[PDB]
Amino acid sequence: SGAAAASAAGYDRHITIFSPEGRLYQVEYAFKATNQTNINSLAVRGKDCTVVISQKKVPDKLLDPTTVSYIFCISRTIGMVVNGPIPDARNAALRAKAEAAEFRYKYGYDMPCDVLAKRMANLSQIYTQRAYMRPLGVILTFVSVDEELGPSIYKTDPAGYYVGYKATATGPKQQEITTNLENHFKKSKIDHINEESWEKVVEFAITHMIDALGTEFSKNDLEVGVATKDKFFTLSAENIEERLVAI
């Protein structure tokens, strides 16, 4: 009964058609695309240092793993990680990287992740008004270390919804992760996390997406980002060898 009158009587191939339930369904069918990789990222705050982690799978040997990456350095002080197919991640990445710029040409400073999640999300709405473009099947995360707000995470979905979480994950496996840090925060009642160094905060976030994820991870199956004042960048592989020795 739920989508039976949907799948039969249209309502599932035009974007701009409501159902008598009120629900439009096309965008509500976009999200199935986000999980077409079986991939599962993460993000958390700091005292001044932010981090985001992603798997990086082990397909057939012929790839050149230097280039497979879902972490795109947008501008300085900014970065982003996607959840969805690669091509529908670029067109969002590039429509942005030429958007932080003109701001800095037209207003005299660099955009935060506030506006950058309000702008790019003020567009994916529009493409769910008009028939210009199928809505990009993604759900993307932003990061930054701002001057006026400190660390900051934000999030954007194909409708246009955006909220700045305190910590979050995404993918097929949110419930397992999200509980393995929701319960952590009610312990301490700190929106941020301790361990001043951007180093020591990584190893916090790794191990929580090991115990609650479901297996053990090497250096190659991961790719990780970080945000610090004046910079955004990626990382090396030793941070786990200096974990299990301590344990």
Partner 1 sequence: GGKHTFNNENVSARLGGASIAVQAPAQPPPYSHHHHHH
Q: Does 126 bind partner 1 (CB under 8 A)?
A: no
Residues 6+ apart with CB under 8 A from 76: 110, 230, 231, 232
Q: Does 13 bind partner 1 (CB under 8 A)?
A: yes
Footprint of partner 1 on residues 52-91 (CB under 8 A)? none
- Residues 121-156: b if buried by 16+ CB within 10 A, e if exposed: bebbeebbeeeeeebbbbbbbbbbbbeeeebbbbbb
Contact of 170 with 177, CB cutoff 8 Å: no
Query: Regarding beta strands 71-72 and 50-55, do their DSSP bridges make them parallel or antiparallel, or are they unpaired?
Result: unpaired
CB of 9 to partner 1, least distance (A): 8
Q: Looking at 101, 126, 131, 237, which residue binds partner 1 (CB under 8 A)?
A: 131
Q: Looking at 7, 9, 63, 182, which residue binds partner 1 (CB under 8 A)?
A: 9
In the DSSP assignment, the letter for residue 231 is E
Give the nearer residue to partner 1 in terms of CB position, either 12 or 48: 12
Contact of 151 with 48, CB cutoff 8 Å: yes
Q: Does 94 bind partner 1 (CB under 8 A)?
A: no
CB of 127 to partner 1, least distance (A): 12
Which amino acid is located at 80 in the chain?
Answer: M
Give the nearer residue to partner 1 in terms of CB position, either 11 or 232: 11
Contact of 33 with 85, CB cutoff 8 Å: yes
Binding mask 14-53 for partner 1 (x = CB under 8 A): x---------------------------------------
Q: Does 4 bind partner 1 (CB under 8 A)?
A: no
Q: Looking at 7, 10, 101, 191, which residue binds partner 1 (CB under 8 A)?
A: 10
Residues lying near partner 1 in the complex (CB under 8 A): 8-10, 13-14, 131-132
